[PDB]
């Protein structure tokens, strides 16, 4: 078996060498002749209150009006972002939740955490009460992120270093995605729902094929683990966030790392990332109570969304790009514009 | 709310806020604790691949919630930041092994120095004490695992049973071995409250109420400038 790692290292060196004869010019060279956006002035338009403990997750609805959030007091709340009303309030069986999702149709939500289960809730019932309809058991570690491919398909990320593709009607995994050595922490879908990315604590991000059920590509470059991952509107690029105050933008076909968005006045690590409707702004929530906004083409820090008094845990940009929502550990949600 | 239909939406939101207000009071009146240990340490006796379990006990009309982590992996670093709001941490140790004491000591060191576990005080139980006596009066030693036991003598020690002084010396040597780590740092933000716990030793729950009472009382003094 010792005569195998030599070849493995040789093949790894080939891969790097082959990728090395492609970086003719960095993005800055191309993009140095475009006028930047300058300054962005976004101020709070709404404040959502009613959570008891800290907030770990949220997800915008495709209506661009509704949203859902999760806190450790064991509660799900669905808001109305225009009139600041509350539409639903759902209590959980286990109070250590870590993630929430909204169906594209808008008929369902999901959540999970330190219980090794992903639950499904039905929003449209003949009786006026949100009820649990499917519990997905079979993971060995905690659930970190979940997203709905569609109404009957869901992809989950776990703390047992594996991902899975499920089938809500029967409740059995149809595919298991293995290969990560450290625990996966986040995932992002593609607009065509044919591919998805995922990051782990072993400082590696891998591309997976949903239909094939096999790894397709690998990306590297971070010193520390991966906290949150986001994906470009085209379907060609994806950007992530780590614990070392760094954020990149890797390409799929180029298979390498583009211009890096970092500054030297930031010491803490990122918690969540998101994109704008056109990819002209990159926003990331940090541990220093703030929420930075960057120029996604020229790596210029333009705009700071201050107003929280604790750690920013989540972000979100609506479908048509009108507003942004932020959650935090002081139990407040703020809608910017 | 200039419309009749919009009127009823505000009303429903108000009902939801009333329900949320009841929950806040209930949340406010409860104390959460985290339980940690190993396989040898019989923490289970003191108390379907599920991930966490919960146990509830009440003393003097006060509710305590104890969370025991179930089927998770060998890495602890990242799911431990969810517990930076608890009253205290209960650590259970099996002191009779001797050979595997290095691992409990290093787990204690990792827990005490954690970045997200600042201002969290720890309650220590030294479990299965009666088994140590039967393993030291008969004669496996401690010198072959800990060479500094031959230059240790019993200190303020109060051997309440008092049958053997050698048993007392070994007990308090283990106790000092554990308490050596606490004094190295922590700058008066969190404390350690050891106990010598027998296999059964059912005074455990009372020990917890008193320790929590002390922790909360000290916490406030610091806040008002009294300390």
């Amino acid at each position, epitope marked *: 078996l010792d005569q195998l790692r030599q070849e493995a290292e040789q093949l790894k060196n080939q891969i790097r060498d082959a990728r090395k004869a492609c970086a003719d010019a960095t993005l800055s060279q191309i993009t140095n002749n475009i006028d930047p956006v300058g300054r962005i002035q976004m101020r709070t338009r709404r404040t959502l209150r009613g959570h008891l403990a800290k907030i770990y997750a949220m997800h915008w609805g495709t209506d661009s009006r509704l949203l859902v959030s999760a806190s450790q007091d064991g509660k799900l709340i669905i808001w*109305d972002s225009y009139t600041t009303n509350k539409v639903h309030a759902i209590p959980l069986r286990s109070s250590w939740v870590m993630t929430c999702a909204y169906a594209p149709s808008g008929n369902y939500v999901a959540c999970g955490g330190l219980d090794n289960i992903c639950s499904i809730y039905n929003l449209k019932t003949r009786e*006026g*009460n949100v009820r649990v309809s499917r519990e997905l058991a079979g993971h060995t570690g905690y659930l970190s992120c979940c997203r709905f491919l569609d109404d009957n398909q869901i992809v989950t990320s776990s703390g047992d270093t594996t991902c899975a593709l499920w089938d809500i009607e029967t409740g059995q995994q149809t595919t298991t995605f293995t290969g990560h050595t450290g625990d996966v922490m986040s995932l992002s879908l593609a607009p065509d729902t044919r591919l998805f990315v995922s990051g782990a604590c072993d400082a590696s991000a891998k591309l997976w094929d949903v239909r094939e059920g096999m790894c397709r590509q690998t990306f590297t470059g971070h010193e520390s683990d991966i906290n949150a991952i986001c994906f470009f509107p085209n379907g060609n690029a994806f950007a992530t966030g780590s614990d070392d105050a760094t954020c990149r933008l890797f390409d799929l076909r180029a298979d390498q790392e583009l211009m890096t968005y970092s500054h030297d006045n930031i010491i803490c690590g990122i918690t969540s990332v998101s994109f704008s409707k056109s990819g002209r702004l990159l926003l990331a929530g940090y541990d220093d109570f703030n929420c930075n906004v960057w120029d996604a083409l020229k790596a210029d820090r333009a705009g700071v969304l201050a107003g929280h008094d604790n750690r920013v845990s989540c972000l979100g940009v609506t479908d048509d790009g009108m507003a942004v929502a932020t959650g935090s550990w002081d139990s407040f949600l703020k809608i910017w514009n | 709310t200039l*419309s*009749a*239909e*919009d*009127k009823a939406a505000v*009303e429903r939101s108000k009902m939801i806020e009333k329900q949320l207000q009841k929950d806040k009071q209930v949340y406010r009146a409860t104390h959460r604790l985290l339980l940690l240990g190993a396989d040898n340490s019989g923490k289970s006796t003191i108390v379907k691949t599920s991930g966490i379990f919960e146990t509830k006990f009440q003393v003097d009309k006060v509710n305590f919630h104890m969370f025991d982590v179930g089927a998770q992996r060998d890495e602890r670093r990242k799911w431990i930041q969810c517990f930076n709001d608890v009253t205290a941490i209960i650590f259970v140790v099996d002191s009779s092994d001797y050979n595997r004491l290095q691992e409990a000591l290093n787990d204690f060191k990792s827990i005490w120095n954690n970045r997200w576990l600042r201002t969290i005080s720890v309650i220590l139980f030294l479990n299965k004490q009666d088994l140590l006596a039967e393993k030291v009066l008969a004669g496996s030693k401690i010198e072959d695992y800990f060479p500094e036991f031959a230059r240790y003598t019993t200190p303020d020690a109060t051997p309440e049973p008092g049958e053997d002084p050698r048993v007392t010396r070994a007990k308090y040597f283990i106790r000092d071995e554990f308490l050596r780590i606490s004094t190295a740092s922590g700058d008066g933000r969190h404390y350690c409250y050891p106990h010598f716990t027998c296999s059964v030793d059912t005074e455990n729950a009372r020990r917890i109420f008193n320790d929590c009472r002390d922790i909360i009382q000290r916490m406030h003094l610091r806040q008002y400038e009294l300390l």
Partner: single-chain antibody
Amino acid sequence: VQLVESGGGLVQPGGSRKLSCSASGFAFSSFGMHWVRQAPEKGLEWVAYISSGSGTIYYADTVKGRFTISRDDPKNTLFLQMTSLRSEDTAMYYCVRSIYYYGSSPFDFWGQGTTLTVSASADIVMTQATSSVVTPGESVSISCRSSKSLLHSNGNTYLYWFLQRPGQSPQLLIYRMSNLASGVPDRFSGSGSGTAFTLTISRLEAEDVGVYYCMQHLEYPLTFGAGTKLEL
């Protein structure tokens, strides 16, 4: 989701009756409850409204003080209290469910009602165009009319269609003038855009026979239309 009523009967003038509608099979403590009167030879008319939280109450302008309302969450039972019965106070009464949040569909589930036989203003006026008129396979168009702009500043248009079939209790076809109900076929559509409204039907089956009704939910009077029967 099924409801069974009680009460009714024939009461001599000047009497006192406690009419009731009893819920079962759903979260009755989260819906606002109505009561709607049906004249045997006329259309429908609304009488009162009780909210889920028992905080808001409206009454019919015709009868206000005499009638009383009450709900019982611990048993899921609704009541209407009627006193000093007059000649006009004899028709059919229907208990209608309704739940209000963003995207909801009020007036969706009705009961079946009961009867009560009696022996010897500035509200928006809503009117239909015709009263009766087809072939199984042709297209039908029914026109309603209003007297004030039903469009609000938010963007909503509070107009409903019901299709009370010849023999059973009413149902819901179109809520807010454009949207379709749950179990109705995808052959019905609402196309108003003016104080003049219309329900077009592409095909025509044997179940589509009945009388259509027109309602406005903009203000509390809840004035109805007149009705347009279709005959095979």
